[PDB]
Design a protein around this ligand. Structure first.
Ligand SMILES: Nc1ncnc2c1ncn2[C@@H]1O[C@H](COP(=O)(O)OP(=O)(O)OP(=O)(O)O)[C@@H](O)[C@H]1O
Ligand SMILES: Nc1ncnc2c1ncn2[C@@H]1O[C@H](COP(=O)(O)OP(=O)(O)O)[C@@H](O)[C@H]1O
Ligand SMILES: [Mg+2]
Ligand SMILES: [Mg+2]
Lengths: 486, 67, 470, 39, 35
């Protein structure tokens, strides 16, 4: 055990200027004499700038720093499912060590141009608004952006809970393993989230990487890359993963702290010059591999908190430029009763219909066109009774489809029931009903179709489309329940 | 074999526990009482060392025949 | 232990050179040859066996070469039931002229946050007796609350009303931490706690410990006094299993204090002029204010929002550390409605139908929705005027104004500001009154009948009196 | 039964380590033999 | 921007407030006398 070492020249704010270590590599993991870890970020002619994976009160001037000879890596594998880990993969839920066999570097490069195939398979969230108007595909990077307390973590948690129907089935092609990286959150918030995922039985296929608010800035910086490596394990082995960075604003803040303390040249909002490089090299790793590479995929759902809805800030601009679309949430829509508070006018999915089943495509094209016309003429509400019959019909259909998109928390819907509900909506079978009942109807009708009409739902789920027999049967079911509805 | 001295000579030392419930602690009881208080109070409040008796209710009913 | 010498004094920052035995970071050093006790907290090792430190008191009269002694530990404050009814400063000295604080154990003000396996998920509503809080953003037992507001919107009055109600209804050793606030308010609170019996100068059954570092303190004292109060509350939580209340006013000052030394510690400023270490400092402080499996800490923190921004890095960073934020608005205080709680900006993580019941949740959502609709209609009202509104919309505006007034409430501590009597509305009364206003059960009564009343029966009685007068 | 087993075995493991701290030229010679065995 | 006109202050928000107060003091008068 003969190791190459150096002396701590100085220590402060979690940065150790270290003498010696002549052969340390850039981004190499070193170990301090107190047992703490560090990463060599600055290789300078006379010193090395080490960022400390912990509390700097244990490091003193003169302490011995050993090399490890390895870039930072994390354990990967299926042994991590159901575990809560830190940024370095150490178990923090007290359930014993992670019995993993494989380790993967956190800073590997993304797949190139050729190993990819187009994003074509749907990633079902269970939220009607997302699955119909902002469809997400496997291999996509869809941003969840919004102000504080607007319902972003709820969208991520619904997407995680929804994959239980696929992970309990036998179709191995449709199974999605979830990963929830929590950066800069309270430990009690993460405990509430873990309890919510356990109650929904969603932990057995979920990893929770936890770099919380009291963890050092390097750990919050590194947690998204650790989670991304844990998901790349599945993406490389023919399986499909989903990863939620909650959120990337806090990782940017941690990286800015590390950079400013390392005396790196600050830029706009004091962020370093390579914060775009940071988020882009994190997000380009979510890919869809072709069959020659196993056909696996990794879907990224980064989260961004905007201040007062300012999407022209630095980090929102960067991550909006990087991703393949955005799900925008509004607090005004939240308090109007529209929940999930998705802004359909601003939300976008540049993958689009290529990430939808044919049935959802059928009903969702119509729903999108109708909601667009409604948004065009929606200012004329408060005067609707004094325009054409066409304008009043646009307003009526628009509010019906709007109430059709509201959804409860922690209750993701299967794609067949979403299609049935949107069918009842965009076919006109809710125009005679008044708005204050739509939601109620949407519930009762649902129960009906779940109880006595498993054949139609199963046939839609198996076909992926609404064939003419399916169309007619849906027609009769809807009209019968509507005629017999209170 | 300093630790190997430790590992055997100390596990042997702990094994000499004939009259020792907790291997010569002289402490850890001042907090054990708190842990067992918390653990018991969060599992319930009655005596969780005996079998529970059962009182059972009957649903309510009203006059339903045509008035 | 080890002895060094002052080699530089710039503002509240002091450099000390140790020949033997460099002290770890966060140690407390005592300056030798001073009338009062001056403590320097180590912040950086500069190399060449020199440490940079932050002064806990004034640096005037310091001389280069003056002797500095290492204590071997961080600032250790006395903890125990003897601190109840006493006032201590950042370094644990008694500042109430009542003599020393003879505890039997001392705790360092720097400690690690509780682990993840020590967290408790129990969420139980804490009824405060305030209408808007309990209705729209109710507080939970063992949760972190936070009260946001600009200068003069009512953070102190609301935190004092919470003290009054809860702490006098509580049996768990409250702890108040004045962090960079007015000394006048500290004296006021001390005496209104003595006269309330919560602090007893004899027969020591006091149930509140006070920790104070005010605006006239250096940046170091204002940055560490929150940790001192936190450490008192932490002893009460861990080593006694009690359920502690932790009032902090104001926590923004903590953050601000860091800024006032940041550049002097040799750090490039971040955005809006804040220390590069803002989020992590706030994290390592706030992650210790938490309920564990060993005890419970309900914490109410008044959070100053500079210039009514709410996007400034300090409040925006604080938002993610709280369970039930109460945001006070100047646009609401200028209407005359108190407390100035913004109903469309306050939040609670227990505003969940599976927790507060479907009736509570439905009433809260209906109130918020009618207020948002009133907001949307006020533009039409500005353009068209009121007489050209639909009748459903005139009804919406009437019920919305009535709900606005009914969210107001007279406080027991504001009896001088209003002349009114204090009202403590129970939870079911709040839900019932707001349900009845939303249902239309009081369309015939005026809107000034709901201004500064308690339960809805008081609104009815006030309307009857207002009519009987004219 | 688990929690009492955890506090105890924890109070054991820090005891046995603290109890050998209270407890050698053969080692000093063995160290140089190991440094020779480094090669 | 639902209450944007009266949150900005200014002539269009001060006239809205005056109009609201006029209408509802009228209605509170014609509601109290009918009690
Ligand atoms: N579809 C919904 N229906 C009803 N309530 C909802 C819905 N979605 C979210 N909420 C509620 O709105 C509140 C905020 O949602 P959430 O915390 O998930 O968003 P967030 O952006 O992650 O908040 P934060 O700023 O703390 O990160 C929560 O209390 C949640 O219960
Ligand atoms: N609940 C209230 N009732 C009546 N007046 C209030 C109330 N809250 C605040 N005020 C008024 O606003 C002023 C500012 O109160 P204060 O508690 O000092 O706010 P802050 O702590 O944010 O500076 C008070 O002097 C008082 O006149
Ligand atoms: Mg969240
Ligand atoms: Mg104040």
């Amino acid at each position: 055990d003969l190791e190459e070492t150096g002396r701590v020249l100085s220590i402060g704010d979690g940065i150790a200027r270290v003498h010696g270590l002549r052969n340390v590599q850039a981004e190499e993991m070193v170990e301090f004499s107190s047992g703490l870890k560090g990463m060599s970020l600055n290789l300078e002619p006379d010193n090395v700038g080490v960022v400390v994976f912990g509390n700097d009160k244990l490091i003193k001037e003169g302490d011995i720093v050993k090399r490890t000879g390895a870039i930072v890596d994390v354990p990967v594998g299926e042994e991590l499912l159901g575990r809560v880990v830190d940024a370095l993969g150490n178990a923090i839920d007290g359930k014993g060590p992670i019995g993993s066999k494989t380790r993967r570097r956190v800073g590997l490069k993304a797949p190139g141009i050729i190993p990819r195939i187009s994003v074509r398979e749907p990633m079902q969230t269970g939220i009607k608004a997302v699955d119909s108007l902002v469809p997400i595909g496997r291999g996509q990077r869809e941003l969840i952006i919004g102000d504080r307390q607007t319902g972003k973590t709820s969208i991520a948690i619904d997407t995680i809970i929804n994959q239980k129907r696929f992970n309990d089935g036998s179709d191995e092609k449709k199974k999605l393993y979830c990963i929830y990286v929590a950066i800069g959150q309270k430990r009690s918030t993460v405990a509430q989230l873990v309890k919510r995922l356990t109650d929904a039985d969603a932990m057995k296929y979920t990893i929770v990487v936890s770099a919380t608010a009291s963890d050092a800035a390097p750990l919050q910086y590194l947690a998204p890359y650790s989670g991304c490596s844990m998901g790349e394990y599945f993406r490389d082995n023919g399986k499909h993963a989903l990863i939620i960075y909650d959120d990337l604003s806090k990782q940017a803040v941690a990286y800015r702290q590390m950079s400013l303390l390392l005396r790196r040249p600050p830029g706009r909002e004091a962020y370093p010059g390579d914060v775009f490089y940071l988020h882009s090299r994190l997000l380009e790793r979510a890919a869809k591999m072709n069959d020659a590479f196993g056909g696996g995929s990794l879907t990224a759902l980064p989260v961004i908190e905007t201040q007062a809805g300012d999407v022209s800030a630095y980090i929102p601009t960067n991550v909006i430029s990087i991703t393949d679309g955005q799900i925008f949430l509004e607090t005004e829509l939240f308090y109007k009763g529209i929940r999930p508070a998705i802004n359909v006018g601003l939300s976008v999915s540049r993958v689009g219909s290529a990430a939808q089943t044919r049935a959802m495509k059928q009903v969702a094209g119509t729903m999108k066109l109708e909601l667009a016309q409604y948004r065009e003429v929606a200012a004329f509400a408060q005067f609707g009774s004094d325009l054409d019959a066409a304008t009043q019909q646009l307003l009526s259909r628009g509010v019906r489809l709007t109430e059709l998109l509201k959804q409860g928390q922690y209750s993701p819907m299967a794609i067949e029931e979403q299609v049935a509900v949107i069918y009842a909506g965009v076919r006109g079978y809710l125009d005679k009903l008044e708005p204050s009942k739509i939601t109620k109807f949407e519930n009762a009708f649902l129960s009906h179709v779940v109880s006595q009409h498993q054949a139609l739902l199963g046939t839609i789920r198996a076909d992926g489309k609404i064939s003419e027999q399916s169309d007619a049967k849906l027609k009769e079911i809807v009209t019968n329940f509507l005629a017999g509805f209170e | 074999q300093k630790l190997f001295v430790d590992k055997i000579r100390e596990y042997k030392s702990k094994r000499q526990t004939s009259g020792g419930p907790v291997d010569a602690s002289s402490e850890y009881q001042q907090e054990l009482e708190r842990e067992l208080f918390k653990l018991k109070q969060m599992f319930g409040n009655a005596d969780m060392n005996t079998f529970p008796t059962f009182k059972f209710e009957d649903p309510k009913f009203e006059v339903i025949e045509k008035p | 232990a080890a002895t060094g010498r002052i080699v530089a004094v710039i503002g509240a920052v002091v450099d000390v050179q140790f020949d033997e035995g460099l002290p770890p970071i966060l140690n407390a050093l005592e300056v030798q040859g001073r009338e009062t006790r001056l403590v320097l907290e180590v912040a950086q090792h500069l190399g060449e066996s020199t440490v940079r430190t932050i002064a806990m008191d004034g640096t005037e009269g310091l001389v280069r070469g003056q002797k500095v002694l290492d204590s071997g530990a961080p600032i250790k404050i006395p903890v125990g039931p003897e601190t109840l009814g006493r006032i201590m400063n950042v370094i644990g000295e008694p500042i109430d002229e009542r003599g020393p604080i003879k505890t039997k154990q001392f705790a360092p003000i720097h400690a690690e946050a509780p682990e993840f396996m020590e967290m408790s998920v129990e969420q139980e509503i804490l009824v405060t007796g305030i209408k808007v809080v309990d209705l729209l953003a109710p507080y939970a037992k063992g949760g972190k609350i936070g009260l946001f507001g600009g200068a003069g919107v009512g953070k102190t009055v609301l935190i004092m009303e919470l003290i009054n109600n809860v702490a006098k209804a509580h049996g768990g050793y409250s702890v108040f931490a004045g962090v960079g606030e007015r000394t006048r308010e500290g004296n006021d609170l001390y005496h209104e706690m003595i006269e309330s019996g919560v602090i007893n100068l004899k027969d020591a059954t006091s149930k509140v410990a006070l920790v104070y570092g005010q605006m006239n303190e250096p940046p170091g004292a204002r940055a560490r006094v929150a940790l001192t109060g936190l450490t008192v509350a932490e002893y009460f939580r861990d080593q006694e299993g009690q359920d502690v209340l932790l009032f902090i006013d104001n926590i923004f000052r903590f953050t601000q204090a860091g800024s006032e030394v940041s550049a002097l510690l040799g750090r490039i400023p971040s955005a809006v002029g804040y220390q590069p270490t803002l989020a992590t400092d706030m994290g390592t402080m706030q992650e210790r204010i938490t309920t564990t499996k060993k005890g419970s800490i309900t914490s109410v923190q008044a959070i100053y929002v500079p210039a009514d921004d709410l996007t400034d890095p300090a409040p925006a960073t604080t938002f993610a550390h709280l369970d039930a934020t109460t945001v006070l608005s100047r646009a609401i205080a200028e209407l005359g409605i108190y407390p100035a709680v913004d109903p469309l900006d306050s939040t609670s993580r227990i505003m969940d139908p599976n927790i507060v019941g479907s009736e509570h949740y439905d009433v809260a959502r209906g109130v918020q929705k009618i207020l948002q609709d009133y907001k949307s209609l006020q533009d039409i009202i500005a353009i068209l005027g009121m007489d050209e509104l639909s009748e459903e919309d005139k009804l919406t505006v009437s019920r919305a104004r009535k709900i606005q007034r009914f969210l107001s409430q007279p406080f027991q501590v504001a009896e001088v500001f209003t002349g009114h009597m204090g009202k403590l509305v129970p939870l079911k009364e709040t839900i019932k009154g707001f349900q009845q206003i939303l249902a239309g059960e009081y369309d015939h009564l005026p809107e000034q009948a709901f201004y500064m009343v308690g339960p809805i029966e008081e609104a009815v009685a006030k309307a009857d009196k207002l009519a009987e007068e004219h | 039964q688990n929690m009492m087993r955890r506090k105890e075995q924890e109070h054991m493991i820090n005891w046995v380590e603290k109890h050998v701290v209270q407890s050698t030229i053969a080692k000093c010679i063995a160290d140089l033999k190991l440094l020779a065995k480094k090669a | 921007g639902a209450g944007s006109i009266r949150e900005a202050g200014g002539a269009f928000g001060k006239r809205e407030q005056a109009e609201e107060e006029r209408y509802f003091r009228a209605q509170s008068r014609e509601q109290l006398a009918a009690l």
